[PDB]
Amino acid sequence: SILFSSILFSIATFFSRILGLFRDVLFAKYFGVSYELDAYFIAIMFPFFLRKVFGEGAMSSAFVPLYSEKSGEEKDKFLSSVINGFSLIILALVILSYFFPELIINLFGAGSSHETKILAKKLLLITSPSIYFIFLWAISYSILNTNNKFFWPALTPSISNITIIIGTFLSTKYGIISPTIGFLIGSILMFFSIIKSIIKHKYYFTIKHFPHFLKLFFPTFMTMVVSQINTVVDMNVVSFYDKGSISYLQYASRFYLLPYGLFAVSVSTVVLSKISNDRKNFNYHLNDALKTTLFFTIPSMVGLIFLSTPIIRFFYEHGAFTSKDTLITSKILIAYTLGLPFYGIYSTISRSYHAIKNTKTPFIAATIVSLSNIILDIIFGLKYGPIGVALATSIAGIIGVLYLLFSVKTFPIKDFLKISLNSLIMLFVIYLTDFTDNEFWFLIQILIGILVYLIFSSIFYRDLIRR
Ligand code: NA
């Protein structure tokens, strides 16, 4: 029982990590880089952006306290208010979307070609309704958060991936609309997966509590918008360059995002819970988290940059994804990957501040990062295209972390220097091993790099290991 629960949950988490990668592999094989996939991304970008905002707690942060302070029927009324109000908004937001699709389109792919915008308009007819099920999924999620802190809903998004993957398999019959339908159905099934939390409540035909809830919800919602806006800006900027730019950024983003989610984000969740449970030792916990992030993100970066082309070719260069796409996506991946350690630090510091209820400093950091990213998007995007946009993302990350480090005034410098030294030693060794051109050699280079890095980590952290 107890053992079963743990092993099943761990399997589900592992597969959750794998499914995004597999979906992008299938996109590469079945669509490659094309205006069609660009239009798909434009069509799914607004609902995806909203789900990303709500997953960071934009809904929970305002809903949970206002919901908990209420009692009896009023509680349900509050819930109903939230459901009704947003539904109304969403309804308007869908109706307008049907009549003025250019409004939605120009937010994410203003510069894309005519055929791309026509196809994206077509796909919005399928993706716009998913916003409704995404909002309801979010609300359900919050209600659960009163019952238990986090739990499985974190894995409910996996549902979406499965359906999209299924759609991709069927695309040989129908084309891009099959993955788009897959996206919509996935949204609906997410909502159904956690629907129990709302379906147990009585429905009231009211928006009694909605204005007050908006008064408390809008500030936090906008902070999260700013914190998540960089991807929208990057997408809309590169939309002005040749077709497939959006798709290139997505493909490179996958391999940026695996190590980021595994090394940075997880450390950040741990530190948030730790500091929230043990506030008075803020510094200690923060330092610990920082060290951990640096221990994994610096070598990863090095490795990923050195092996970016064989990695991209191994995972993507099949079917519709060509060697040209490999070249371009490799360069973009390098540009993104220069920023990995900085965004790791950034995430850790931001969530520590959140752990002590400081929203101002994280919001200022996010503002610096987004402003920097748009400025550098214009400049470097004009000079270098998509690669310039990715590089702008990395540099903006650096600036943000400089602000956060000066603000929090704590950092494990000694461990940073040790980790950097080990990473350069590792790089030297794998450079020596790069003497043969084989499509699978990079896997043994990964093993060699890991071994060297761990050897020198065990040398330089011998006292810690012993104790
Ligand atoms: Na950028």
Residue numbers in the entry: 2 to 468
Manuscript text:
The cytoplasmic-facing Lipid II is flipped to the periplasmic side of the membrane by a Lipid II flippase, after which the GlcNAc-MurNAc-pentapeptide moiety is incorporated into peptidoglycan and the lipid carrier is recycled. MurJ consists of 14 transmembrane helices (TMs), of which the first 12 are organized into two 6-TM bundles termed the N-lobe (TMs 1–6) and C-lobe (TMs 7–12). The N-lobe and C-lobe enclose a central cavity that is large and highly cationic, properties consistent with Lipid II transport.
One of the inward-facing structures exhibited a partially dilated membrane portal but was otherwise divergent from the rest of the inward-facing structures. Specifically, the C-lobe is bent with the cytoplasmic section swung ~15° towards the N-lobe. Conserved residues Pro260, Pro300, and Gly340 serve as hinges on TMs 8, 9, and 10, respectively. In contrast, re-arrangements in the N-lobe are restricted to the middle section of TM 2, which also bends inwards towards the central cavity. Furthermore, a reliable in vitro lipid II flipping assay for MurJ is still not available despite attempts by us and others. Based on the abovementioned conformational changes, presence of the putative thin gate, and the unmodeled electron density, we tentatively assign this structure as an inward-occluded state of MurJ. In the inward-occluded state, Arg24 and Arg255 are brought into unusual proximity (just 2.9 Å apart at the closest) on top of the unmodeled electron density.
